[PDB]
Enzyme design. Structure first.
Site, PDB file in Angstrom:
ATOM      1  N   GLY A   9     -43.878   7.906 -29.069  1.00  0.00           N
ATOM      2  CA  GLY A   9     -44.036   9.530 -29.059  1.00  0.00           C
ATOM      3  C   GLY A   9     -42.949   9.799 -27.855  1.00  0.00           C
ATOM      4  O   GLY A   9     -41.639   9.264 -28.099  1.00  0.00           O
ATOM      5  N   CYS A  10     -43.420  11.100 -27.498  1.00  0.00           N
ATOM      6  CA  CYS A  10     -42.464  11.480 -26.417  1.00  0.00           C
ATOM      7  C   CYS A  10     -42.940  11.452 -25.181  1.00  0.00           C
ATOM      8  O   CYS A  10     -40.877  11.812 -23.967  1.00  0.00           O
ATOM      9  CB  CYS A  10     -42.469  13.561 -27.119  1.00  0.00           C
ATOM     10  SG  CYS A  10     -44.000  14.076 -26.761  1.00  0.00           S
TER      11      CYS A  10
END
Lengths: 134, 137
Positions: A9-10
């Protein structure tokens, strides 16, 4: 062999990389000089986005860290730009000695020129978060 | 007391709004250029940044007119290291190089401020994803 498949993810993690190591107890993102005066996010001058790694040398050595550092990126590109460069900022003569040393190794080991720059830590600013507007 | 609007417009829409509807410009393509690594990708651009390929018909519009549009779209009078304020011209031949350098000097002379635009040779250009080049996996 076996296969795992993960998506990060981020919400990571240039610091999480080093932080995940046994023996490093904390890490801070910051901007390391370099002697350019008054760096900013708009103009970093000679300062580079850097990780300050506080570690317990009774658990890992500076050479073990050096080793993971070099396995964590591929510094085989010529580049003038301080911001895209692989850099080691040494805090003493020992770290510097060790860092020049292992660089020589790796270059032999493979032949390739490695472009990591060895320079003393002269400045280090913590990273600032952006101002929220209300 | 003033009023406030807040919008988000993706960076890659800019090229067609900036140059796309200029008379004589036939097409624009977003891409990546100006870095070092042999192959940037959606997952890592290395040291490249957002660039634009402008295909134009020289019988309608000249390279000089495009440079004037480029410098009317931004104000690069501060030294920067920041990709979001990039100002770069990638010349394809020495004719473009000398027109860009000559116009840079004219702007510097006419307005009194150093211009921080870099004029460098085009070496590689990578086509980025867009609605007409989606990169289907």
């Amino acid at each position: 062999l076996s296969i795992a498949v993960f998506a990060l993810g981020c919400f990571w993690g240039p610091d999480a990389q080093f932080g995940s190591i046994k023996g490093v107890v904390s890490t801070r993102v910051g901007y390391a000089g370099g002697t350019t005066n008054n760096p900013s996010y708009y103009n970093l001058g000679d300062h580079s986005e850097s990780i300050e790694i506080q570690y317990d040398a009774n658990v890992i050595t500076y050479g073990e860290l050096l080793n993971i550092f070099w396995n964590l990126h591929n510094p085989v590109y010529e580049t003038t730009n301080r911001q895209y460069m692989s850099r080691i900022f040494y805090l003493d003569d020992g770290q510097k000695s060790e860092a020049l040393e292992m660089k020589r190794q790796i270059e032999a080991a493979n032949g390739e020129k490695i472009y990591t720059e060895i320079v003393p830590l002269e400045n280090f600013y913590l990273a600032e978060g952006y101002h929220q507007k209300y």
